[PDB]
Structure formats: structure tokens, C-alpha cells
Amino acid sequence: KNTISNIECVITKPDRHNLITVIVETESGVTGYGCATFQQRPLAVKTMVDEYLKPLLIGKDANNIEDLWQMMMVNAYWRNGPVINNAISGVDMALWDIKAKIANMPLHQLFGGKSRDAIQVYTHATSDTMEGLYEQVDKYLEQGYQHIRCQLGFYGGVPENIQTAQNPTQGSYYDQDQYIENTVEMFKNLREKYGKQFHILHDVHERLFPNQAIQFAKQIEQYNPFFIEDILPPSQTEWLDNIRNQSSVSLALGELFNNPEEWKALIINRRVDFIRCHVSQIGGITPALKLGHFCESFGVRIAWHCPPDMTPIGAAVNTHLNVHLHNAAIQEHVEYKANTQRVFPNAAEPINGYLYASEIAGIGVEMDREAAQDFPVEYRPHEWTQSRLPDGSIHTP
Amino acid sequence: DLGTENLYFQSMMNKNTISNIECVITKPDRHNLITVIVETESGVTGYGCATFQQRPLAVKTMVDEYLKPLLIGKDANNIEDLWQMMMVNAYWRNGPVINNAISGVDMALWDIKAKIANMPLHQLFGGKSRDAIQVYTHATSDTMEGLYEQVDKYLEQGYQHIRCQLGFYGGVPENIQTAQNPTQGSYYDQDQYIENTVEMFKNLREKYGKQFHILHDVHERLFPNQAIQFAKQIEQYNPFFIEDILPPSQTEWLDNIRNQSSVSLALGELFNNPEEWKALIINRRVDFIRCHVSQIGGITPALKLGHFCESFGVRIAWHCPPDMTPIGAAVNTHLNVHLHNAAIQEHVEYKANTQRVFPNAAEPINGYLYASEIAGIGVEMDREAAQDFPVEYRPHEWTQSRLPDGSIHTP
Amino acid sequence: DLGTENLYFQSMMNKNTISNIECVITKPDRHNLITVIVETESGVTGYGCATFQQRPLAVKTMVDEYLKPLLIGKDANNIEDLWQMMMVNAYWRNGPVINNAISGVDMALWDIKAKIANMPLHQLFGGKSRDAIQVYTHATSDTMEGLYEQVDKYLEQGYQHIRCQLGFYGGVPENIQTAQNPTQGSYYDQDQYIENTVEMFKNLREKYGKQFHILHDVHERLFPNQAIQFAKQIEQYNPFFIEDILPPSQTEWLDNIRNQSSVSLALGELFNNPEEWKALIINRRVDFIRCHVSQIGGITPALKLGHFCESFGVRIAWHCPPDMTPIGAAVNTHLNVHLHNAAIQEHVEYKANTQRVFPNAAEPINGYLYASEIAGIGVEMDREAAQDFPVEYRPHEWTQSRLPDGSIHTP
Amino acid sequence: KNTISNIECVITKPDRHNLITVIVETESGVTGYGCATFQQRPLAVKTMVDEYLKPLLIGKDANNIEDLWQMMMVNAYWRNGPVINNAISGVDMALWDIKAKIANMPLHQLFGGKSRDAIQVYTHATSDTMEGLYEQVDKYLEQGYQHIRCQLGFYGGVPENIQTAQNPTQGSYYDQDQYIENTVEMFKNLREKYGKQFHILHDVHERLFPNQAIQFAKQIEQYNPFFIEDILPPSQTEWLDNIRNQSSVSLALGELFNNPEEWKALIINRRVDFIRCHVSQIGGITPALKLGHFCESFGVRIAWHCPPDMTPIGAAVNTHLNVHLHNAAIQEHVEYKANTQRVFPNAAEPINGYLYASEIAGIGVEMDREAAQDFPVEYRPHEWTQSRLPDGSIHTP
Amino acid sequence: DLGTENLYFQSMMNKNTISNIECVITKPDRHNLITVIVETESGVTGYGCATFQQRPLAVKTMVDEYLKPLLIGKDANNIEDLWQMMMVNAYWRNGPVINNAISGVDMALWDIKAKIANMPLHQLFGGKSRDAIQVYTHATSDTMEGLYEQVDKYLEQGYQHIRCQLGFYPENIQTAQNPTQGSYYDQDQYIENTVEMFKNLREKYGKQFHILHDVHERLFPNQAIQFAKQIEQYNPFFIEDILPPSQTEWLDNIRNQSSVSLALGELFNNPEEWKALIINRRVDFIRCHVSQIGGITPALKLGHFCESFGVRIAWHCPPDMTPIGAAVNTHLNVHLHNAAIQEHVEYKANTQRVFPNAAEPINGYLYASEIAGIGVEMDREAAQDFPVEYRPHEWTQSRLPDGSIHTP
Ligand SMILES: [Cl-]
Ligand SMILES: [Cl-]
Ligand SMILES: [Cl-]
Ligand SMILES: [Cl-]
Ligand SMILES: [Cl-]
Ligand SMILES: [Cl-]
Ligand SMILES: [Cl-]
Ligand SMILES: [Cl-]
Ligand SMILES: [Cl-]
Ligand SMILES: [Cl-]
Ligand SMILES: [Cl-]
Ligand SMILES: [Cl-]
Ligand SMILES: [Cl-]
Ligand SMILES: [Cl-]
Ligand SMILES: [Mg+2]
Ligand SMILES: [Mg+2]
Ligand SMILES: [Mg+2]
Ligand SMILES: [Mg+2]
């Protein structure tokens, strides 16, 4: 019986992103750390943890993670969504951290142990020129990456070479046909230069309307991308059937999900090959395990969302999940910077294309509380989310 | 092109630039209520409901820290752009906290547009498609006789529809066989609830026959096999609707019910993601949609959802609980007299403190709620009154709903 | 209840009683155009489009003899009730004659409401969700070079989308192997049409590459096996859309296409019954809905259909042919800047006679149509100008479309 | 080769209804008569015939009914709907009348002859009291009817015993629950008094919302009605699946149809037992034959709509169709009055529960042109179509 | 009741009582043909086609021993009732022998009705919806140059559609040691010859004419699917009988991934064979042999059923059919709006003698007869110079290299 004695939520911005950590203290003296990172609205997550989860949780038994999760999820009656789920996730991860520490085992060992030696990793190559891409690709290949997500061009900002209306509404503009043309050209160039040296990934980032997605799938399937990610927004995934009926292209989707109705039909109908959920968005380790299991039955594999806007605690959690879950496929990775490494010591980095799970007791990564205070929250507008098409229409960003 | 430039100039002339956004939490009676206020350079002020009573400070953080700096300086006229833009602004989206904050703004923008048009809100929409909306109220008691007393009172007031509940479900497990040291929570027994409710319907029909329409809210208390059995048990009593017979995540089990029972079904007060309702409606799994307008992001998506339902022949009974501002209720009445497929409006009487903070809140008359006829929504918040009643923490222990073995059930 | 009585009194005060209904047919240029005019006691006049060019006198009989005595004395404010009531008023319903007559009234009532609100029509709806709508125009010629000439002209004007057609299809069967004494009609050969069109796409892409979006209207010329083959033949050329690849009665054959071709599809200009579009959209058989707004009964059902399409991710390209008043076109532009899922507006230049009868008709500027910014729809009919151009009988011989063996095909 | 020399459209109102007849003259001297009756909008039908069908048709070969039908149907480009279809129907029926006359055969013999001796008939018993119903039922039983459509109560007019809003909008009001209660009570009374002496039919006339229709189906299925008609409006027939899945009630629908999309899914999915199309509403004899054939394949039977608002020419056409089409089931009938019999001589009336097809050349019933002029068109508002529910909402009438 | 009896008198005065039923098998040329003749008290005689060439004595037995005593005395006017009655008369129903026998009577009854009406058959139906029906003919050879020679001839005659078959030139196939007797073929060789045939024709003639090809149920489903993808680029007007009637659900696998135009149904004699096929749009043309489904009466209904689903009609018109049957199909083809094309093979002189006035295509079109009735009858004295003769039809014992029977 391990009574929860305190709950804290710290927002820290060591580098580019507002990061959110939840800290759970227990009377047994064991402390857990969890990721609650919803970078766009961090003060709302912190309010949720401080004003609501904390008085709910203090005095309750930390051992019973499953009950505390089921209870937390329905506690406000209305449920699901990014603010509640991230707050819960931070607590849930911290609770698993504590249980693993008390067991004196690495997190993935609690789960049932390894089903692979380490998880393969992909990184990001992004440039406004092919030469910029080549330079980044060559570097990553030298470091031993076998999977690289490639993007030609940047899409947003002022509408310079775009035929807008005469007085366009303020926003971040792009042209879907330009994006398609550039991306197809990128794939053609890369295959001509590198052949089958590495797996090419690409993130469509819900930029397209359904008919454009179906066309794009047909234009790039010959290049056998390891996956094409978020080819459609979450509200339109039924359109995937048109693609699956006539194209061999490998698809990944789901980083935006925070309600189970978003993924069930998707997986039951085998509309994607990889699920890309952001663990903290779906409510933490507890539901991530069940989702991995649900996918496994249908033969869908796992590529959890691992963006720079996530703590290294969250990344370590994902690696524990990835070496355990038999249907885990690959882990997204972006290099950490000095400030972030200082606030979150011992964060693992890929080695020759692989990320290895921590082997000490717990998640294996905590937050240095003193170092975090050197980097308070800082407001950012995130102007790219005001994504507009040439006619001035908002499109899903 | 000069002509095009002139047309834009003319657009700028009729602009209503947002000058301020505020979020007030107020608790005049039992519930923490949330109002968003939007001011414009033209001096026209809008009021909207952002009420998520269980997490009000999170909604207020959302409005104050994020929606405000996003919206100041923008043209209030273009509600549709502002809604589409607000909905995706955090990238991750949907959910009760963001949707309520957005609803508060959306409703206030519609209020502003209607005031500038000098019309009641429903007239902006396209006008009335009914004279007024029928209303149901709530009768709840731990005895059948206590229920009859409340029923008799409402029938005398002219209500023709009453949501009836026999028994109270929650609290300490007094007459429930739990494990030896039950986990702290609000306990109930599903079988006792089913038994009490079936008996309630039987007794009401014996006593009142066809005098009034009987509604009942299952409130996601049941597992699917219990739901299917219950539908067969009470279908003979022809409820006007049986509400939330299953939680949002299990609505595919409604097919089993629709295939074998004639029972009339309502669902959806918990929805805050469109994936929750699309399959539900497309497959005609319910007869009434019950969404909470602020939970789905305001008037803008409510109109669309109304129209979507209408094509499938599904009707509308928006959620109108005590935990909603009278502003939200007035908005619902405007939507209800306008949308042709609206069916009925839930109502609970306002207490004096609430009436003080929100003057002119409409009450049903002979079983009908009438839409406001002055410009705008027609109901505002008294800001000075509101501040006498600041937010106050409530745990809402009923949401820790436990079954006899100590497990959580959807509350 | 006195308070309720006062509220009704207040409703009566803001009433706009219909005082007159008129229907004018006018033919300033090539087409018989139809405008409905609605007057109110308040002195506010509305204008709407009721254009069914092939049967204008039937539409006028419908307005003058039936809708007029039905509507005089009724409150114009309640567009939604008036629409629901008009739609069922003859018992039998739907169809091009009744829908157009109703559309004329519905659009004029919306015009009146917007004028009384002192807002542009799109602002009544909820405001803009785009700055302006993109526009495509028509290029048609019997030679590839003649097509390039028209294309070059439109590209210079800033169009980014052009509907292209190579060859003309109809008239006497000059180079067609018919039976010995072919029945009188407008003859064409499906295979020659397919061959010409495929070559047209190939040549345009070779000449212009990705410079502009290519549209093409199949105009229900084909049998389903021809449609499926054609989709596979031109999908590589990525048309912006292929329009009416099948007649309305054969759209289930679109599944065969959707399952094997990436081709972008548009359909629906012929619809005047909701059963024609529901399955189409629910099953995502097209990418753009193409309904003719007056054919489906006006702005009121157009808004609903827009919203319905939006939930399924289907976008909107309302039919905007020469046989429609500039009033109808302005209405379409208002719907297009408002509805978030609107995609593009078809446009053909107005001739001087037409401009005289309908002053202030908007023209595209650099490939965009901008919504009017004055109160109302923004475009009216000049009644004195209109009468210089009375109805004139036209047979429309192209609708007697025959295949080489002499059989009728959907025209 | 039989050239069309003239086309005329006469509206006549010998009794209660504006009736519409189309007359086609041919150079061979043979004259055809057809029904185009859309009683609510007769001047629009007449305009359509006079101003559009006539100049299209004069000079064309009357023999080729199939081509003339296909051609007429698409002639305005936009198509289907009650005004165009009724005008076409009048011409189509008149063309078949001419062909039968030239063949010197009764219409049904042209078709392929009889597949039954005569068609069974039902009539209408309607009263605001049960005693009124009993009196009408007893009469019809005595005349040898074995099928009677029964209705208790009248639904419309001023809202006397209805709880409306305080100032209800002008219209024709009814209460759906009152209607259901009365109708169930009617069935119970009739079965108690008459047992299985006759088949009971009832017309719901689209008065109900879907959940009310499903309930009503369950409340009356025990009474084994011969059919329940129009239990739902045409836009909601997909709801019939809920009924068909759980109720044995026999259903009829379709009098409102004037677009084939309205009936195809209905019949393919066996959602009704009888189709009730109004022949002139679907465009005449030509499409009625095809529809009968289409239904036959699916096992759906035919009860063509035969209301008082139809010429006796139209009724005779329906009897010719009914003795020919093997899946025809029953013919609705209402007695003709003196004025109507004068304008349309020799109209057949049921005999001992049966209607017999005409046996002279042609349809067998024509219009007396002189007698029709004594009864010009007269405007009627048809106020019942402004049908409102207690809250003042329009409902499908 | 008086008025009803008076109606019953007028009907009686117009009744046309069947007085005799006859069935003649005749073999003027290559095929045993079957004609039913119905006589009436009117003195009006009708002729119909009952041709099931492989089993003609069974059909004749069916007519002479069973339909004849059933029909004598009954009113010929009521074709619909007599059809419904005949179809269920042996309780067990459907099938090629019963349906052909019934078809002969049915067509003959329509012939009589049209003669009494003094109208061409198609005019009874409601008249023309086209001027004439386009025609395809048969080009068959064991060499490409033989094919070219026939194609060139037909093109000069004005045909725009040609069914092309390139056959083999079990002596060259790898069978087992002592192959069971039968008519052997190799599916892979057939597929290869056919693909190369299409390729050559398009190379040589481009889009000069529409190419049709009859697979004649020779393939397994995986081979049918492959073949569809192999020839779809050549845009055949239709590929006929790509699968046997029992395996048509496999057509979905084709429809989901190929644009190939398909026709099927000449083998059908039971409605259950075509309903799902049409409801699910699994073919583009229905190919039913009219006498196999039981005559004009059900052909009219089937055409209407097809029309609703957008399926078009190409009735089976082989050489093993009377010219009476062919004329009936042309009447059906000029009337039904969804009729597409009529198969035709040239009549030889003996057949012309037995069936005078049989129409031939003119410039790629067949014109419906314009006299009263079907327009073609059998000359009974000439028919008896050509009595039935037994033929084994050894091609129906169709075997694969391993000795297995395959659908022929
Ligand atoms: Cl930023
Ligand atoms: Cl755009
Ligand atoms: Cl109080
Ligand atoms: Cl509480
Ligand atoms: Cl509580
Ligand atoms: Cl339990
Ligand atoms: Cl000009
Ligand atoms: Cl013309
Ligand atoms: Cl023309
Ligand atoms: Cl043709
Ligand atoms: Cl009346
Ligand atoms: Cl009501
Ligand atoms: Cl010869
Ligand atoms: Cl042989
Ligand atoms: Mg991504
Ligand atoms: Mg509830
Ligand atoms: Mg078009
Ligand atoms: Mg009826």
C-alpha cells in the first residue's frame, strides 16, 4: 500500500519547446516522473494537474494504477481530449515509474520483458533544396540510420509565389499542388541518387484533401516509402478505403488521436499499417499497452509519435514500450540539445540506427528540478497552425 | 484591380474588430458556471456559455492565456473562419476543455452578429420553423408516492413530458454486498437499478396511463447485455426516450437493440468529438441526438450537426442540465425554434441567485419554452452580480461511481 | 400567460408580411431567365432566381397561380417554415418545376432578411471562411489549336482552372455510320468523343504541363463500361475533376471506378430529389457535389446540403451555367465564400444585354470571384430593362441526343 | 407510320377534384386519351402539355411509344418530378390507347393478355366514430368487398383538443399520439366485432416520425392488416429496415414517388410488400410496366394508387395493368359520381369485390369533350397540406 | 351480374382457342433446329423457336407428349397466364428441355397475337426505341492471316464489330501417358494466343473496329483475372463468358481491379443464375439465349430488370437457332432501349429454304421485320427434306492436359 503524498506539474522550456513533467511523491519515499507534454497549451495542462488531479489523488494507493487510470478518466464526467488526457498521462507514467522502482526493474521488464533487442530509429531530413537534403541524408547514413523521413521544401509563412485573393487574410499559406509536385520530385531524386540504400519516410501532415491524397498515393507507391504519414486528417480516414483498394502504399496515421473512436474503425478495417499515437495524448502507458495489444490482433504495427515537443522521460517510456510490445516497429527520434540534456539527464540517443531501453530501475530518466527552474514557460503563438490555402481557407495544419 | 480594392475597402468599413475577451466563472447556486464575454471596437458586446462545470479553471486558463491573444484584433464578422481557425489552433483538438472555451467565443460572436443585425438569434439563422419548443422536466424520488407528487405538480403546470427516476444511485454501499473493505467511491447495484426502473414504468402507466410522455435517463449505468435486456423490459411502456442506455464507446451495441426492440433512444450529451456521433447517426442507432452544445464547440457546429441529423431523420434534444448558464439555455431555445428537426428542450427551474446573475432567463409556460424576441441571444450576465459568487472547488464525488465489487463504471 | 402574450406581440412588431409575389421571364441574350420578386409591407423587396430555362412558362404558372395566393399575408421572416411548408404544399413534391418556383421565393426571402439585417447575404450565414472563391471558365473548340488559343487567353486573364472540351457533339450524323434512314435528332459517337477527349488531355499536358488545372464535362454521354474505361484512360493526366461521368440513375456504377481509379469526380447538376445525392455522398462516390441551387429548392436546402457534404469530406462546386440569372450567381458566390467546404465557382462572361437587365453582376478578377459587400444578395433585376426582352420559345434540339443506331441517350 | 396531328390538355372538375386529360390526335384519324391528373397543380401540367409537349410531338410517329417516352423524359434536360411526369403520362397513355385501337384489342391484350380473371378491390371506410365506421363497413361487406381500408377519426383543421403554443401558426393541426391511440383502438374494435370476416387496410399517410412508426408497427402487427400504407415518408424509407428486422407487419408504400431513386433501394432490399406508385406520377404506362417487372423479380407486389383525384381513364388503365401484370395484387377504388360519369362515360365499377378490365378496343374509356367544358378548372387551396404538429411544425402531409 | 357476363361475352367472342401443337426438328445445314407450330380456331398459325440443338428429341418429346395435351383448348390470347401456367406445370421447373419447349409455344403465341393485331412483333411491345440494331459477326481461324482475311471481308461489308477467335493451328500438349479420350486444349496456350491476337489486331487495324472475344468458360478464376488485366489495354467491346455460370462471384475480383468490358449468360436457364449477377453489376452485357430462359415473355421482363441496373443486352444468336428465333431477337433488339448489339452468322441456302425471308445484316445493321407477326415462318414441306440427324458434339467432352473435364 503506497499512499500518494504530493502531485506537482512543472513546465520547462530548456530549448525550443514548452515541456511538461508531472511529479508524484509517495509516503514510501519513492518518486515518479511522467510526461504530460501538450506544448501548445501547457498552462491548461498544469491547471488541470494542480487544481484537479492533485486533490483527487493525494491519499490514494499508488499501487493500483489500473483503477486510478479508470477512475481519473471519468472523473470530470466529460472525458477524452488533449488537456485531460495529458494531465492523466503524466500521472499514469509517474505511477508506472514508481512501481518499476519499487520492483527494482526497468519499466519494460515490469511489462513482461523484451521481445526485441532494441528498436530501430528514424530521424528527420528537411530542407528547401535537394542539395540541403543530400547533405543531411549523407550525414545520417554515416551515423548508421537506415530510415530517414525526408521533406523537400517548407510549407507556410507569407504567400510569396502563391496566387491568393487580392487581400489575403493573415495566416501561414501553402499550395497543395506545389507541395505534391515537390514531394514527388523529392522521391524521384532520392531513389535515383540513393537507390535502395535506405528506407524513405514522408509526413503529409494532413495537408491534402481526399482526392489529392488518393492521387498522391498513386504517384509515390512505386518508390516504396517505409510509410506515408497522416495522408489524411483524423476526421476523413474512411477515405482510406479508396486508397487501400487500389494502392500498395504503406500508411501511418494517428499522432493527433485523443479519443478511441478515432482509431477503432481505422484498425479494425486495416486502413493503416502503423499506428502513430502520441502516448500522452491517449492518456499514458496504461492505454498505450492496451492499444498495442488491440493493434497486434489486427496485424497493425506501432510507431508512437516522438516529436521534439516531448520530454526525454516520454521518449524513454516509448523505448520501454517499443522493446516490449512485439508489434512495435520503429521509433522516431530528434537529437537533444545541451539545455534539454541538463534538465533531463541520461536521455538515451540512438546508436547505429537503434535505441536501447534504459536498464536501471524505473523509466530511467527523471527531471532535475533545480535546472528546470532556470527555464520557465514562455508563451509561443505557434503561427503555423493558422494554415491557409491560396483562397484564404483554413486547412487542418 | 481597383474595383476589387474598393470592395475590400467596403468589407473593412463593416468590420467589427475584437477588442477584448474575458472569461468569468460564477457559482450563484449549486454549479460553477462559465461565461465568455467578447467586446468589439464598435462597442457591441457578446456573451457565450463555456460551461464545463467539473473543470472550470482549466476552461478559464484556456480562454485567458490562449484564445484571448489569438483573437484580439480579428474581425468578429467572420464567425465561420474564426471557428475553423480556433478548432485547429493548438494542433491537437476536440475535447471538453478546448471545445468549451471555443464555444464561449463562438456563442458570443453570434450574439454580436445578431445584435448588429438587430434581430433575435433564431431570425439570423433563417427564422422559426415552430411556434415554440416543447419542454420536459425532471421528477426524482426514493419512493413511488414521492414521484407521483412531483409528477402531479408538473402536470398541473402543463408539462406533457416528464423525465422520471425512481431511487437514488450512489454514496456508501449500505444495502450492497461488496468485498470486505470496499474501495472509497459512490456505490450502486445495476440489478437493483434495473428492477426499480422497470417497476417505476409499470406503476406510472398503471396510475397515469397515456396522460403524459415518460422519459428516463440510464446515465451509462449499464453493461451492454443489461442494456439489451432493459430495452426489452420497458419497450411495452413506450418511453418518449430512453437516454444514454450505453456509454459513448459502446454504441455499436445499439445495433443489437435496434434489431429487436421498438424502444425509442436518445444519446450524446457526452460527445466532444465528431467520430463519436457520425456512425451513430449514419446507422440510425438513436432517435434523438443529445449533444451538449458547448461540448461540441458552440452554435457553429450545432447548426451543422442539426442539418446532418436532419438528412438521416434523427431529431434533436440538446442537453440542458442545471450546469449551464441561462445564456446557453437561451441559445438552445433559439436553435430549437429554428431547426426543423428539433424535438424537445430539457429544463430545470432557475433559482433566485442564478436569476440575479443572468436576468431575463426564460421559464417554460404550459410546457413550452419561447425564444427571446429582442436583438441578440437575449440573455446576458450581470458582471457585478457574478462577482459576488466566485468559483468554489467541488469534488463531484458521484463521478467515482463503483459497482459492488469495487470497480469503476462510467458515471 | 400575459408575459408570453407580450413576447408574441413583440414578434408581430418585427414581422415582415409578404404583400406581393411576381415572376418575370426575360431573355436578354441566349437563355430564357427567370426571376421571382417578393414585396413586403415594410417596403423591402427581394429578388431570387427560378431559372429552369427549358420550361420557363411552367415555372411562371407555378409561381403566379399557386405560390402567390399561398404566400400573400405570410411572415417573410420565417424562411425555414415557409420553405418546409412550400415543399410539401402540393403533396407530390421535388422535381424541377416546383423546386425552381420555390427557389425563386426562398432566395428572395433571404435577400429580404439580409437587407433588413443591413448585411451582405454571406454575413447573415455566419460570415466568410475564405477571402474569395476560385473560378473556372470554359474553353471549347473543334481543333486543338483553337483550344490553345482560348486557353492562352484565359491564362493571361489569370484563370488557374479551365474546363476544356475538344470537338462538338450533336447535330446531323455527318461522319457517323447510322441506320439507313436515321430518326431525327442530335447525333454523336461515343467512341469518337472518348478518343478526342483522351487526346485532348494528352496534348494539353504536353503543351502546358502543370500550368493550370484541367476540368472536363462528360455530360452523361457514356454508358458505364465506357465511363470506367475513360477514367482509367485519363487518370494519369490528373484532371481537377471529371464531371457527370454517368447519369444520375447509374451512380452506383461509380463504385467500380472508385475501387480502381484515382480520378477526381464531380456530379449532381441534374439532381432535384434528395434521394439522388444521399447514397452518392454517404459512400463518397464523388469528390465534388455539383447541384444547381435553384433545382434543389434554393438557399435553404443548399446550406443543409453543404453541411451534409462537409461531414463526409465532400466539397462543393455549385452548377453556374449561362442559363441562370446573375442573381443566382451572386447567391452562389455568397454561399461559396461562407461554406468552408466550397471549392470553386464555374463562370461564363455576361453579355451586355444581360448586364443591362441585372446591373452590378460580378465578374472574376485574376481567377477569383468576390462576394458582394452591400446589403442583401447585391444584384437585382431592372424590371423595365427586363421587359424589352420577353420570353421566346426555344426547342433545345440538343436534348434529343441520339447514338448512331438512332437511340436516345441521356443528353 | 402514324403521325401525331394534335395534342390537347383539358382540365375538368365535374365533382370535387380538378382532373386532367390529354388528347392525342393522329393523321390516321385515331384518337387517344390519357390521364395527367396532378390535382394540386393542374394549370402547371396544362402549361407543360400546351407550351412544350405539343410543339415537340406534332409531326412525330405515334407508333414508337418507347422512343417517344425516352425522348420526352430527357427533353428538358432536367427531368423527373410531378409536373413533367404527369404531362408525359397523359401523352404516353394516349399513345397506348391509339396503339390498342389500331390493333383492335383491349389495352391489356396488347401487353400479353390476362394473368388473372379480374383484380380484387378495396374501398374506404372513414368516420370520426366507430359507429360511423361500422355502418360503412357493413354496407361494403354487403356489396361483397373483402378488403376495406379503415380510418377512425379525422386529422387536421383547427387545434381544438390539442396543446399548442399560445398563438399557433395557421395550419391544419393533428396530434400523432392521438392518431396512434385511435388507430390501435380502431383495429382492436374491428377485430373484436368482425374477426377475420374481411381484410383490414390502413393508411398512415406519412403522419409519423420513424420511432413512432416502429412502435405502431409493433402495436398493430397482431391484427394482421392486409397492409399498412405509407408508414414513413419517402425520404425516410431506410428506417424500414428497423421494422422489417423485428415485425411481421405487411407494408405498402410509394404513391408519392416520381423519381426512380425513391423506389430502387426500397424494392431491392424488400423493405415493402406492395408498391403503391401513382402511374401518372412515374410517367405513364411505359414505366409502369417496367416497374411491375422489376418488382416481380424481387417478389414485391403491386397496388397502384387509385384515388378520387384521377380520371376514370386512369382507373381503366390501372385495371388493364392489374389483370395483366402477374404480381398485381389489388386495386383501390372510390365510387364515381354522376357528373364524373357524364364526362367519362362507361367507367367500370367493382362487382362483388372485383374490377374487370374493359374488353373493347383501346383503354375503353374516353372523355366527352362537350361535357367537360361544363366543368372548368376551379382553384382549390388544399389546406390539409399545411399539416402542423402541436408545436406548430410542418410535418409531411 | 349482367354487365360482367356481358364483359365475359365480349372476351369469349374474342378468345382464340388453341387447336393444335406441333414440333418439327429440321437439319438443313450443320445444326438440328427445332420449331414449334401453334394452330388456333382463328385459323391464325404461329411459329416459335425451341432450339436446344444438343438434345432435340427431348424437346420434341416434351412438346408432343406434355405441352400439347395441356394446351389444346386454351385461349391463346392470354400469353402471360399460359406462360406462368406452363412454367410450373411439371412442378419441378426451369432447365433447358422444359424452357425450350415452352419458348417455342410462347414465341408462337406472340406471333399469333401480332398477326391478329396486324402489327410487326416489336410494335406490339410498344414500338422502336432505335432504327435498327448494330451487328457483330464471327472471325475464326487457326492463323492470324486467316483472321486478317475474314476481318478485311467483314470491314468491306460494313461491319463495325467483329468477334475474333484464334484457335490452335492432343498432339502437341503434355498429357499423361494414356490420355482419356476427349477434346484436349491447353489454357496457357489459349491465353497466350489470344493476348497476341489482340495485340496484332490493334497494331494492324488500330481503332477501325470493335473487337469482341468469347472465352467460352475455358479458364479457371485465377486465369480469368490474369487475362482481364492482360487484355484490358486493348479495350475489347466485350469479353464474353470469362467464367462459367457457377463461378460468377469471382467476377468481383475482376470488377475491383480491371476496366475490362464483360458479357455473360448464354448458358442461363434459371433466374437464380442472373439476379445477383445483375444486381451487383458483375457484367456489362447480359447474353441469355431467349429460348433457354423460356421465350419472349421472360426476355421482356429480364430486359426491363437489366435496364434498371444499367446492364445492356446482347442476346445469344448462334448458328444453332432458327431464323425465327433470330427475327424475334431483332424485334426485341429494336424495342428494348437497353439492347446493344446482335450477334449474327450468315445463313446457308438450305436454311434459307426452310425458313424463307430471314433477314441479313445491311451495312452493319439488322432491321426488324415490318410485316405482321414475327415475319419468318417455317416451310414445313421443305423442312421434312432435312430430318433430324444424331450428332455427338465431341467438343463438349473438353479436357485439360491431365485428362480432367473442364466446362466446355
Ligand atoms: Cl511561433
Ligand atoms: Cl485554395
Ligand atoms: Cl430560489
Ligand atoms: Cl460534490
Ligand atoms: Cl456528488
Ligand atoms: Cl460488481
Ligand atoms: Cl456583349
Ligand atoms: Cl435551340
Ligand atoms: Cl440546340
Ligand atoms: Cl449505337
Ligand atoms: Cl381545400
Ligand atoms: Cl409537436
Ligand atoms: Cl449456302
Ligand atoms: Cl460432332
Ligand atoms: Mg507527424
Ligand atoms: Mg443525461
Ligand atoms: Mg455540367
Ligand atoms: Mg395513400
Ligand SMILES: [Mg+2]
Ligand atoms: Mg458465347
Ligand code: NA
Ligand atoms: Na481495386
